[PDB]
Write a protein that binds this ligand. Structure first.
Ligand SMILES: [K+]
Ligand SMILES: [K+]
Ligand SMILES: [K+]
Ligand SMILES: [K+]
Ligand SMILES: [K+]
Ligand SMILES: [K+]
Ligand SMILES: [K+]
Ligand SMILES: [K+]
Ligand SMILES: [K+]
Ligand SMILES: [K+]
Ligand SMILES: [K+]
Ligand SMILES: [K+]
Ligand SMILES: [K+]
Ligand SMILES: [K+]
Ligand SMILES: [K+]
Ligand SMILES: [K+]
Ligand SMILES: [K+]
Ligand SMILES: [Mg+2]
Ligand SMILES: [Mg+2]
Ligand SMILES: [Mg+2]
Ligand SMILES: [Mg+2]
Ligand SMILES: [Mg+2]
Ligand SMILES: [Mg+2]
Ligand SMILES: [Mg+2]
Ligand SMILES: [Mg+2]
Ligand SMILES: [Mg+2]
Ligand SMILES: [Mg+2]
Ligand SMILES: [Mg+2]
Ligand SMILES: [Mg+2]
Ligand SMILES: [Mg+2]
Ligand SMILES: [Mg+2]
Ligand SMILES: [Mg+2]
Ligand SMILES: [Mg+2]
Ligand SMILES: [Mg+2]
Ligand SMILES: [Mg+2]
Ligand SMILES: [Mg+2]
Ligand SMILES: [Mg+2]
Ligand SMILES: [Mg+2]
Ligand SMILES: [Mg+2]
Ligand SMILES: [Mg+2]
Ligand SMILES: [Mg+2]
Ligand SMILES: [Mg+2]
Ligand SMILES: [Mg+2]
Ligand SMILES: [Mg+2]
Ligand SMILES: [Mg+2]
Ligand SMILES: [Mg+2]
Ligand SMILES: [Mg+2]
Ligand SMILES: [Mg+2]
Ligand SMILES: [Mg+2]
Ligand SMILES: [Mg+2]
Ligand SMILES: [Mg+2]
Ligand SMILES: [Mg+2]
Ligand SMILES: [Mg+2]
Ligand SMILES: [Mg+2]
Ligand SMILES: [Mg+2]
Ligand SMILES: [Mg+2]
Ligand SMILES: [Mg+2]
Ligand SMILES: [Mg+2]
Ligand SMILES: [Mg+2]
Ligand SMILES: [Mg+2]
Ligand SMILES: [Mg+2]
Ligand SMILES: [Mg+2]
Ligand SMILES: [Mg+2]
Ligand SMILES: [Mg+2]
Ligand SMILES: [Mg+2]
Ligand SMILES: [Mg+2]
Ligand SMILES: [Mg+2]
Ligand SMILES: [Mg+2]
Ligand SMILES: [Mg+2]
Ligand SMILES: [Mg+2]
Ligand SMILES: [Mg+2]
Ligand SMILES: [Zn+2]
Lengths: 68, 91, 76, 251, 114
RNA sequence: CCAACUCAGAACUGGUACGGACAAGGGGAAUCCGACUGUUUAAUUAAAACAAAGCAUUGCGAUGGUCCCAACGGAUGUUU
RNA sequence: GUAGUAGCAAAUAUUCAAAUGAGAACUUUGAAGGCCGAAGAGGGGAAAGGUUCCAUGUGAACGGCACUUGCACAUGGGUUAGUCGAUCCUAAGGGUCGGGGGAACCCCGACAGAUAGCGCGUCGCGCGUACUCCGAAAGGGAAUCGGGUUAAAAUUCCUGAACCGGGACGUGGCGGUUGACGGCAACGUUAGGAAGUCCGGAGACGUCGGCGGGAGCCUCGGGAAGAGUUAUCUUUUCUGUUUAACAGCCUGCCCACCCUGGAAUCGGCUCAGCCGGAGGUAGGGUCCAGCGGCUGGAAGAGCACCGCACGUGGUGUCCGGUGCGCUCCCGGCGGCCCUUGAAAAUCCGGAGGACCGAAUGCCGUCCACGCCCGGUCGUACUCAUAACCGCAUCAGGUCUCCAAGGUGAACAGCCUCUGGUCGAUGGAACAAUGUAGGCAAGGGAAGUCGGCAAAAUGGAUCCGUAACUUCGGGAAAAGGAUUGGCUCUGAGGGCUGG
């Protein structure tokens, strides 16, 4: 498992053809965006809840988004 | 204080093996565990690694010497004997 | 509080209960630590530090207090 | 009777030499054109201990005469050798402790070690710690040299035989008393299965000529003839004399 | 207190059967075999370690498993000789070569003497 | 401001009990033998016997000493 | 016949109620009272065994009394691997070609010899020292971690998350001053030519002692959750309060190394050493270890507790201290040797630069990402006072890993917690003789071949200690004093603040 630090980088890896699914984990102090790729599970942490909603609706169509 | 009157380093043998053997072995026991002058670096840092092998801690020079002393008495005589012969031949 | 510590409650030797080497190591580390801080604060110079260092190793000072008193007396 | 201890050693088995940790045979370079005519320079890289051998050994690196590669050698270390020293082998090598020269180029009275018996055999004489050979004289007509061996015997060897200048390092080893059976145990642990030794008079007749009797005693002269067959040849073999060596005998 | 067992059929405490105790998210202690200590690269003679290279088992240095920068030193004889040793060789090579030139010239002045 | 447990001493006190169980040398004056540690008759002998360091003698410079092998060869010997 | 006789006796121990059954001192549940007491009667494995493993059932026999019972009998079920091993490598050694011996069975064993082949181009050149063999389930060695799951299997099954060794091409990136850039340097950065040949390192190593560091455990305090005690006392006692491989970043131990600088009034420094014009102290750096820190993995899991239904929801999983403590790992230093304490596979690095592209499009690329592939055999169970050997369910023998609290010098003995267990045929009496354990007035070895046996001494602190001696010892010589409980006093430290 690897951690993505930039939202821009997370979007780039979300558009990869091997990105099988994306899962949204909402904790009590942040939201984690996890994208399952061929080799690694990339995770992005977004402390600001409001800033996380904007990214949630910006994901490419066809990618299986799940809420945890 | 003076812990032993005369035994010295051979005090590790207690009362065993007889006084003469302890006295006899004392000479070599002291010599093989002592530091020797290094002709190369100029320090008293030469100690025996194994019988006949003497290495300097500082400069790392390893020298083949005597079993229990860096230089044996016959070793000095051989060097002078060889030196005398070399001078005559190289004259 | 010191209960149950009399002679009739001791089975090991004083060394077994607390090695003399342990006590010596504690003292040297305490005294050497004290000398370094005095040198760092410039209360003593390197010349006095060296002299005190060898006396500590020589079993001259038995605790922190006596070492401090000797330094004050020597500086006066 | 049964096969005595002396007879069981020849079969090998548990009496073979303990050589697991030995560094290899210590010998001169193979005689070649460079050493026969000129000299070849080598460098001592390390002085090492060889289990079972009192004398230290020296690892020397040489430049191969005609191949692009290094040539590794293992020499019996002479007293005074040190790491980083240059060692010269050949006919024209200078007379200095550590160099290997043919006996023809070594003047009379020199101290040498690891002396060859046959030209090119790479050294057989004076190899133990503190031992050496003394060059006595040369015979240009016969092309031979006289040397005195450590035992005190004089031997004729061809002048082409090589020898290292100096004496073997590690001398004086046997002067120190062992003081303990354990020290002897460790000494022979790395040599062979020869220690401890049980006295023949302490055995039974079945396994030694000296065995038996209601008292411990040999019962017959311990001096046995040269031609005695194996199993009978025990004790003082072909003794020219016995008893304390006094006077000229101990010369 | 919880006591442990070997996780393999190796029942003897050999150097290759070393282990560490780890507490899992399940709240239990368990063994995990630990690889033996490795020396890492060292100088041919002095034996001092070669700086800049980690100490790993031989298979862990495999190019596929270790990045190139971690198994090299950017210098002549990098990873084989220390900086001091390289400096000594360079000076020795230059000075010895210069001395050969002096010897060559010196014998030309004497050769013509006739 | 935070500290762990070693040592020393004093008062009081119990039917002089208190290393309260557990644990844990009897000691001394001598003779004989073997120096010592070690080893030994598995299943009647553990020893004063064996070994031992030390001491001494003997053979042998490799075309060799000692020894194994039916023969060829081999052990000592990666030796001197 | 002996004879229903000898005999059932070591390893502390059983009791009550109920269920089941034709039948219960011996099966099962619950309650109580004991034991093993972490060098275990606990939890595993190597040999050895071979189905003894699990479920159900059971006429007899067998389990030296009994049985409803079972390691017995009958029927059926059960062992899942690219990552754990074998497999590979070599060790002592074993088996061999040729050759030499030998009537032959056989002996020696690379020693009498046109080696095996390998590398690079595309069949040719170069290289080429007579074994491509066997020999380790404790030596060397490519890669797997939590969580969950069975009547019986799992680092093998399920889920999730990783890694290793191969194969193939694509996209992007990188280099062309044809083969990168940065730092005075130690070195740093993710890429960043290259053949034959050559060189080094790792693999790779004894033992003892002292210190230092890391992990797990032990231990103390606070917070919250449940439980125990409660006539009295107790802000109390108990249980727990979790964080894997792997990835990134940070940190930089003990050493080593680099730059500046130039030291006697010598200084620095360890428990001990020891270090310095061959450049110390000091100042500033580099590198190395990690079973160290943070984040991802990852709370979605696990655990505890409280609910609702009879699957599902909620709350918590927090904040510190302490050490000659214990187990393991590592670091560094020192002692010891007439003892110096394996090899090879494999992997990494280096020296050299034959040869090779482009005028900018090709060439090169150990970089990132994507795609494909993963043989064979072993895997149940016991590992022992009942699964191995001893003719047996024999008080014997049989390698090794984990190791809590109290007392104490102490993996001594004694007691306790986790886990295990009450399995040794039972009942009633309390004669002689016996076996094992004790005690005894006064005397004190008179006993006896002989102080055999037993008794006495015993820990610690202080005092004191002869002859003799190889000067090291003798020595704990001998001899004497002290020791509980309770309430106090003194001394011995650390980190911050000019
Ligand atoms: K016979
Ligand atoms: K023997
Ligand atoms: K003997
Ligand atoms: K006799
Ligand atoms: K590096
Ligand atoms: K002993
Ligand atoms: K011979
Ligand atoms: K087994
Ligand atoms: K496999
Ligand atoms: K193996
Ligand atoms: K090994
Ligand atoms: K798993
Ligand atoms: K791992
Ligand atoms: K299994
Ligand atoms: K048994
Ligand atoms: K009775
Ligand atoms: K009597
Ligand atoms: Mg130096
Ligand atoms: Mg203690
Ligand atoms: Mg002391
Ligand atoms: Mg003898
Ligand atoms: Mg006899
Ligand atoms: Mg006879
Ligand atoms: Mg007498
Ligand atoms: Mg004796
Ligand atoms: Mg015996
Ligand atoms: Mg007997
Ligand atoms: Mg007996
Ligand atoms: Mg004598
Ligand atoms: Mg013959
Ligand atoms: Mg009866
Ligand atoms: Mg009986
Ligand atoms: Mg009875
Ligand atoms: Mg019983
Ligand atoms: Mg019973
Ligand atoms: Mg008991
Ligand atoms: Mg108990
Ligand atoms: Mg243990
Ligand atoms: Mg029965
Ligand atoms: Mg069963
Ligand atoms: Mg059956
Ligand atoms: Mg494996
Ligand atoms: Mg072999
Ligand atoms: Mg054969
Ligand atoms: Mg043949
Ligand atoms: Mg050959
Ligand atoms: Mg092979
Ligand atoms: Mg094999
Ligand atoms: Mg192994
Ligand atoms: Mg199982
Ligand atoms: Mg190496
Ligand atoms: Mg010792
Ligand atoms: Mg520690
Ligand atoms: Mg500095
Ligand atoms: Mg986290
Ligand atoms: Mg949860
Ligand atoms: Mg251990
Ligand atoms: Mg190059
Ligand atoms: Mg199993
Ligand atoms: Mg079981
Ligand atoms: Mg077991
Ligand atoms: Mg049988
Ligand atoms: Mg205690
Ligand atoms: Mg105990
Ligand atoms: Mg009485
Ligand atoms: Mg009385
Ligand atoms: Mg009396
Ligand atoms: Mg009498
Ligand atoms: Mg009488
Ligand atoms: Mg008695
Ligand atoms: Mg006495
Ligand atoms: Zn030197």
């Amino acid at each position: 498992p690897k951690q993505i630090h930039e939202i821009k980088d997370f979007l780039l890896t979300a558009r990869r053809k091997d990105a099988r699914t994306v899962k949204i984990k909402k904790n009590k102090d942040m939201v984690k965006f996890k994208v399952r790729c061929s080799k690694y599970l990339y995770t992005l942490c977004v402390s600001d809840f409001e800033k996380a909603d904007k990214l949630k609706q910006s994901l490419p169509p066809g990618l299986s988004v799940q809420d945890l | 204080t003076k812990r032993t009157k005369k035994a010295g380093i051979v005090g590790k043998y207690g009362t065993r093996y007889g006084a003469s053997l302890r006295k006899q072995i004392k000479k070599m026991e002291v010599s093989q565990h002592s530091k020797y002058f290094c002709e190369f670096c100029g320090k008293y840092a030469v100690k025996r690694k194994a019988v006949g092998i003497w290495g300097c801690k500082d400069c790392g020079k390893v020298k083949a010497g005597g079993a229990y002393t860096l230089n044996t008495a016959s070793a000095v005589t051989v060097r002078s004997t060889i030196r005398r012969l070399r001078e005559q031949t190289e004259s | 509080k010191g209960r149950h510590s009399g002679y009739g409650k001791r089975k090991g030797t004083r060394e077994a209960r607390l090695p003399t080497k342990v006590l010596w190591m504690r003292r040297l580390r305490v005294l050497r630590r004290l000398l370094r801080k005095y040198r760092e604060s410039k209360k003593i110079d390197k010349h006095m530090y060296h002299d005190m260092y060898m006396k500590v190793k020589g079993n001259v000072f038995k605790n922190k207090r006596v070492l401090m008193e000797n330094i004050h007396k020597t500086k006066a | 009777g049964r096969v005595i201890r002396a007879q069981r050693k020849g079969a090998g088995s548990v009496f073979k030499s303990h050589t697991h940790h030995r560094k290899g045979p210590a010998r001169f370079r193979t005689l070649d054109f460079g050493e026969r005519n000129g000299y070849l320079k080598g460098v001592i890289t390390e002085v090492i201990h060889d289990p079972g051998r009192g004398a230290p050994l020296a690892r020397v690196t040489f430049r191969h005469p005609f191949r692009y590669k290094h040539q590794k050698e293992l020499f019996v270390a002479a007293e005074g050798m040190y790491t980083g020293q240059f060692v010269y082998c050949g006919k024209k090598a200078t007379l200095m402790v550590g160099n290997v020269l043919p006996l023809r180029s070594i003047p009379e009275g020199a101290v040498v070690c690891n002396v060859e018996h046959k030209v090119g055999d790479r050294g057989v004489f004076a190899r133990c710690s503190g031992d050496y050979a003394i060059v006595i004289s040369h015979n240009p007509d016969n092309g031979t040299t006289r040397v005195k061996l450590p035992s005190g015997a004089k031997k004729i060897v061809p002048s082409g035989c090589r020898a290292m200048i100096g004496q073997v390092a590690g001398g004086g080893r046997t002067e120190k008393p062992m003081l303990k059976a354990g020290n002897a145990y460790h000494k022979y642990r790395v040599k062979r299965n020869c220690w401890p030794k049980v006295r023949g008079v302490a055995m039974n007749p079945v396994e030694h000529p000296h065995g038996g009797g209601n008292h411990q005693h040999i019962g017959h002269a311990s001096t046995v003839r040269r031609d005695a067959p194996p199993g009978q040849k025990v004790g003082l073999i072909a003794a020219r004399r016995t008893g304390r060596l006094r006077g000229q005998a101990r010369a | 207190v919880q006591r442990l067992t070997y996780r393999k059929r190796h029942s003897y405490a050999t150097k290759s059967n070393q282990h560490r105790v780890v507490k899992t998210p399940g709240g239990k202690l368990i063994y995990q075999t630990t690889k033996k200590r490795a020396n890492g690269p060292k100088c041919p003679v002095t034996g001092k370690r070669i700086q800049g290279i980690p100490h790993l088992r031989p298979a862990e240095y495999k190019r596929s498993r270790l990045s190139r920068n971690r198994r090299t030193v950017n210098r002549a004889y990098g990873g084989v000789l220390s900086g001091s040793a390289v400096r000594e060789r360079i000076i020795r090579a230059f000075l010895v070569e210069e001395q050969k030139i002096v010897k060559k010239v010196l014998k030309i002045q004497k050769a013509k003497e006739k």
